[PDB]
Amino acid sequence: LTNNVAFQTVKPGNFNKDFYDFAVSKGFFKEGSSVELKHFFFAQDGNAAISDYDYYRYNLPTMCDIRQLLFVVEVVDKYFDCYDGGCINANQVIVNNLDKSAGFPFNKWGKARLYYDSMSYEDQDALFAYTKR
Amino acid sequence: AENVTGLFKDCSKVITGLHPTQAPTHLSVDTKFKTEGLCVDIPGIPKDMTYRRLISMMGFKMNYQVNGYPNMFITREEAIRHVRAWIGFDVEGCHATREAVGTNLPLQLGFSTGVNLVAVPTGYVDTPNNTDFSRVSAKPPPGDQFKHLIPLMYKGLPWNVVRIKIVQMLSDTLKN
Numbered sequence: 001l002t003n004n005v006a007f008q009t010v011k012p013g014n015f016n017k018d019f020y021d022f023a024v025s026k027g028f029f030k031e032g033s034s035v036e037l038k039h040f041f042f043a044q045d046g047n048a049a050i051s052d053y054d055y056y057r058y059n060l061p062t063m064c065d066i067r068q069l070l071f072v073v074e075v076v077d078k079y080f081d082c083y084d085g086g087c088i089n090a091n092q093v094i095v096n097n098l099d100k101s102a103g104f105p106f107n108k109w110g111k112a113r114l115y116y117d118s119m120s121y122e123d124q125d126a127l128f129a130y131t132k133r
Numbered sequence: 134a135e136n137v138t139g140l141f142k143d144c145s146k147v148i149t150g151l152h153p154t155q156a157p158t159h160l161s162v163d164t165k166f167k168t169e170g171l172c173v174d175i176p177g178i179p180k181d182m183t184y185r186r187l188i189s190m191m192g193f194k195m196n197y198q199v200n201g202y203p204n205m206f207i208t209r210e211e212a213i214r215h216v217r218a219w220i221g222f223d224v225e226g227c228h229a230t231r232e233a234v235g236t237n238l239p240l241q242l243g244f245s246t247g248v249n250l251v252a253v254p255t256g257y258v259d260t261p262n263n264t265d266f267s268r269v270s271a272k273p274p275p276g277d278q279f280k281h282l283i284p285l286m287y288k289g290l291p292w293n294v295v296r297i298k299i300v301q302m303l304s305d306t307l308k309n
């Protein structure tokens with residue numbers, strides 16, 4: 001999109017020295033003991049994002065045994081017959097935390113509050129009806 | 134004759150006694166050279182130049198009395214004055230098998246602190262050159278309640294790591 005690739009890095013964590021001094025004062029963290037420190041804030045260097053996106057190479061085309069699949073789909077469906085679903089109008093959705101990111105390119109002009117707050121119920125129902133075709 | 138002790142009981146499976154030279158004591162020499170309390174040089178049979186005899190270290194009972202040395206067992210009053218230094222201790226061992234039989238090898242080490250180390254079976258095998266601290270093959274005790282040790286025959290550790298771990302554990306437990 002733009003003329004230079006961005007390299008994102010991941011900073012290390014922060015240390016709470018008072019609690020560590022407390023815990024060693026009360027006799028924790030002994031050598032050879034069972035409880036210890038195993039959970040840290042690991043840092044990453046430059047080409048971290050792409051080196052993790054590259055992990056999709058384990059996804060390969062897969063052809064399924066169509067008949068046994070057509071049976072197990074019925075059984076799985078039967079595991080799922082105690083609930084109720086169906087479309088609902090715009091004025092019945094429940095959004096917790098209307099203050100998260102809105103994806104790309106929208107995140108250039110505010111959080112999800114903006115778009116969930118600048119489109120009347122008519123526009124939302126019209127958008128649904130549109131994607132239904 | 135004679136009262137003896139399990140101390141240094143040569144538990145090797147081999148059947149022949151020792152040649153006078155390269156025998157540690159008198160009892161260990163074979164019977165050929167033995168002619169009334171003395172050994173006689175028979176150049177007929179020569180000396181083996183390779184042999185591995187696993188030695189036992191079972192009952193070591195020290196009550197020595199010297200001046201510049203502090204005795205290693207204390208009474209019931211002095212041990213009371215010196216609490217804050219008490220630490221439990223218990224060991225679970227194994228048995229020697231294919232090259233020698235008769236003794237125990239330590240395998241697990243507990244402490245009053247929750248730590249449990251575990252070592253590899255080693256013993257003090259002697260050799261025509263000298264004594265040698267080397268690996269030995271073993272097997273758990275046949276007691277059924279000891280079956281929870283069968284996995285532990287495939288964990289470490291070389292003793293040169295284990296004793297360092299012990300030193301550091303005791304250090305950071307009793308330094309204050």
Ligand SMILES: [Mg+2]
Pocket residue numbers: 223224225
């Ligand atoms: Mg025990």
